[PDB]
Structure 1
Amino acid sequence: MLKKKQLTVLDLHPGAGKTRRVLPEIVREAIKKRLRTVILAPTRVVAAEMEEALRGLPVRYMTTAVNVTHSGTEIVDLMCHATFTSRLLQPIRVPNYNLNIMDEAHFTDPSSIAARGYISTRVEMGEAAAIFMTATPPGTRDAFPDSNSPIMDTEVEVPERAWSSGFDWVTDHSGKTVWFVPSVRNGNEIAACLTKAGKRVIQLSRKTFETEFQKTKNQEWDFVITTDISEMGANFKADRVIDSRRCLKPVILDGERVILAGPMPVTHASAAQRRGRIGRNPNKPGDEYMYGGGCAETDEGHAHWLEARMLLDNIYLQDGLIASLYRPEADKVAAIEGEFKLRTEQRKTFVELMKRGDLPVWLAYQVASAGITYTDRRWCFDGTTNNTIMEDSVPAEVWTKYGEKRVLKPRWMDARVCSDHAALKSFKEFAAGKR
């Protein structure tokens, strides 16, 4: 794998030991061969798990999730997928790594797709080697892969709302269950229904992931209610997965707005990853997987692939050359390479709206390409009345940086900025000039 000009896909089934057994061997061989190496973790939680598997080896942890004293002798760097892409975008030299290892290379967040595209392009140019580690590489059609111990698979109707009757099998269980819901708001409803029935419930989402995951190891629980983020290496000591088989999909309508379509079916890769949370202990057979719908190829036309092209168009590769998306996932978006290339000043605004503003890639691009500077928030208030953001069925209001009370009515509307109370609270602070 380690020889130049080659991309290898390590596709062992979930729980086969890619992180704790294969990754340390790869690191030893890379250090022995003097290969400048990068290890890319999907999340801060996986970076902490990787430090345990690589403990002792000279690895430089470029993350605050690990508290380790770096000796300065390391030729192997470990960072999150998003940190890699962020450093590529920023005015900072990123080493031209001889070996690029990506754990959970199935992650479909825009910054993961862009990291895959940049790395595979370097490999295609014969400049580097790469290893993409995932049980479900792009193109997988098998939602029931192998496991360490047998799994009971059962197609059943799964609640997506609070219930008074008809689902005895859910509460009549004395083990631990991980439940994948289509959204944060749907998770809040089921969590409230299970809590009222006497259950201890922990909720996980992208924004609360590091803090709340700790509680799964630190306290006794009956149910973990989570969005699709737990498909990225999150491990639990559970005997059952309940899977709605549904997700929300960001969709760009007419190139003018982003809506959250669905809930709609997950891909076969997502279903296999959600199922993959159980059946991991060979000494505990009989873990259950209850699924409530079929799979579909819902990544086609999904906004993350267009957003990944917006990231790659603004990453320097060599002169005017632009990195292409990783070949098995390049048809998920109809886009010309270079069409989102911004000039130096607007590109700096684009990065800052993402990094500091915490805005979605699509929304940051609309603001920056319009020649608006980072601190100029007038666009948050001058959109059409149909772009009015609503809070509890009444128009949301903020005090502007000028001391005037205005209705939140963005010029460009992206449903991700108000999809839940936490997201809307953060967008209100942005519109007020608080960050």
Structure 2
Amino acid sequence: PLSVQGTGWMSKGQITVLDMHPGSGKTHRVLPELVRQCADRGMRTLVLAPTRVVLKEMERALAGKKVRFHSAVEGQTAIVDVMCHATYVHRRLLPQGRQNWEVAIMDEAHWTDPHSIAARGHLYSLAKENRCALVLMTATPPGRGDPFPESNGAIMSEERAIPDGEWREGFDWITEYEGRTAWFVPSISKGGAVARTLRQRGKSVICLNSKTFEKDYLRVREEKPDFVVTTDISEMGANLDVSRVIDGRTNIKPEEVDGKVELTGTRKVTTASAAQRRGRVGRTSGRTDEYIYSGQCDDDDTSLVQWKEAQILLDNITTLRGPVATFYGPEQVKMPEVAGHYRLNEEKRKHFRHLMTQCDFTPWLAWHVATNTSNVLDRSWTWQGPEENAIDGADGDLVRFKTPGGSERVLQPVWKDCRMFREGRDVKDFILYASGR
């Protein structure tokens, strides 16, 4: 790529967007050569991988005394640091983890996870302040997008009715297909239903989502399943080795409604997501791959809570001093409040980070708890909410738990986040924290 030829991309203040179409080799070949160019020249470099899977891939033939790796971490002891998007945010929530680099390279910089938005927002702000060089690598950069970008090989894109979960008759083209398929679903619940029918038809299935990706994605090339039923987690560099993509073009849609994070209905994916889902196939020029979709894209995702959670993380990995931080360029329009609105002190920030790393709290719930609570062992907010926030158990009844002293309470949080009781998270897990374990 022309922009990264020579050394000009290394100067402080330079922002390089490596937006090559999928299959160009940006992750496994262009990035390691960028890292090795930074390493043999003694420049402090930060490399951000989307997930731990890709981190260990990035590791191969790079780690040593030159490149120092991190699995969220908190250890201090190395000019090139390679870590995940969330690990970068989590380390900057610490006083001991606010180190800076003169060159920063972020792979899959399109990820709309709040940690990724805050990570590229902070690095973009540092680059705009002439304090580091920034390289963003993604086939779908933030901005205007094409749902059908170029591929290395031909893709047959055809609109078809796609089952909304299980199906009993019809949709024969699904099971007749000779080859492996990647089926994108809006949620884990929908993916479970799709997987039931597929296994009933005698097909091998591997389900990929936010909780199973780090462990099960490795089994895809090993076992070569007929179908990979995945959420949007596979839009960030996953090589599923399939010849057909089935894409309902929908996604779950966490929104803050009436001070509560709701999980109702689905939204049409953005043009960037559909391009990334379609980008799973056509990766080279041999055969003709298939992209079966349904519906049109919707780029207006401003109402999603991920943008508020991104500013929540960005405000707490930055400091009141100096210039105000922003989201990456075009995404700044979606910052819901003025920056710094969610900044907490060092004491509340440790509680804020503890709820996320040790209690699996969402950034939204972790912030609301940390900013209104004074004692980290106090759990009274979990049962002092309004009657509308009462949580039902697996049997549909009220969730009753005993505090360590003997008192019986009903799960009723002041701040209700529906993501804590479904989509990978179990209501039992919230009870362990509520009951004081």
The offset of 1:371, in angstroms, is 2.6
Q: Once structures 1 and 2 are overlaid, which stretch shifts more, 399-408 or 98-107?
A: 399-408
For 1:175, the equivalent position in structure 2 comes to: 179
The offset of 1:56, in angstroms, is 7.8
Distance 1:93 1:422, change over 3 A: closer
Gaps of 5+ in 1: 66-71
TM alignment of 1:174-323, pairs within 5 A: 174-254=178-258, 256-283=259-286, 285-317=287-319, 319=321, 321-323=323-325
CA contact (8 A) 2:146 2:275 kept: yes
Q: Distance in 1 between matches of 2:99 and 2:341?
A: 27
- SS of corresponding position for 1:313: helix
Aligned to 1:429, which of 422, 429, 432?
A: 432
TM alignment of 1:29-428, pairs within 5 A: 29-52=37-60, 54=62, 58-63=66-71, 74-254=78-258, 256-283=259-286, 285-317=287-319, 319=321, 321-392=323-394, 393-420=396-423, 422-428=425-431
- SS of corresponding position for 2:151: coil
Q: Summarize deviations over 1:219-239 as a string: whole Å, max 9, x none.
A: 241111111111011111211
One-letter amino acid of the counterpart of residue 4, structure 1: K
The offset of 1:30, in angstroms, is 1.2
- SS of corresponding position for 1:395: coil
One-letter amino acid of the counterpart of residue 43, structure 2: L
For 2:5, the equivalent position in structure 1 comes to: none
Q: Once structures 1 and 2 are overlaid, which stretch shifts more, 392-401 or 82-91?
A: 392-401
The offset of 1:174, in angstroms, is 2.3
One-letter amino acid of the counterpart of residue 404, structure 2: K
Q: Summarize deviations over 1:183-205 as a string: whole Å, max 9, x none.
A: 01111111111111111111111
Q: Summarize deviations over 1:71-105 as a string: whole Å, max 9, x none.
A: x9941110001111111111214332000000000
Distance 1:359 1:64, change over 3 A: closer
The offset of 1:418, in angstroms, is 1.1
One-letter amino acid of the counterpart of residue 214, structure 1: L
CA contact (8 A) 1:245 1:293 kept: yes
Coordinate RMSD, CA, aligned: 2.1
Gaps of 5+ in 2: 1-8
Distance 1:401 1:288, change over 3 A: farther
The offset of 1:373, in angstroms, is 2.6
One-letter amino acid of the counterpart of residue 257, structure 2: L
- SS of corresponding position for 1:308: helix
CA contact (8 A) 2:45 2:103 kept: yes
Q: Once structures 1 and 2 are overlaid, which stretch shifts more, 324-333 or 397-406?
A: 397-406
- SS of corresponding position for 2:150: coil
- SS of corresponding position for 2:265: strand
Distance 1:166 1:257, change over 3 A: same
TM-score, normalised to structure 2's length?
Answer: 0.92
The offset of 1:410, in angstroms, is 1.1
Q: Distance in 2 between matches of 1:56 and 1:171?
A: 47
Q: Summarize deviations over 1:155-210 as a string: whole Å, max 9, x none.
A: 11111121111211111112111111010111111111111111111111111211
For 1:5, the equivalent position in structure 2 comes to: 13
- SS of corresponding position for 1:111: helix
The offset of 1:3, in angstroms, is 1.3
Distance 1:194 1:84, change over 3 A: same
The offset of 1:17, in angstroms, is 0.5
* Alignment pair present for 1:26 and 2:28: no
Distance 1:421 1:80, change over 3 A: closer
- SS of corresponding position for 1:390: coil
- SS of corresponding position for 1:158: coil
TM-score, normalised to structure 1's length?
Answer: 0.93
One-letter amino acid of the counterpart of residue 343, structure 1: N
CA contact (8 A) 1:42 1:104 kept: yes
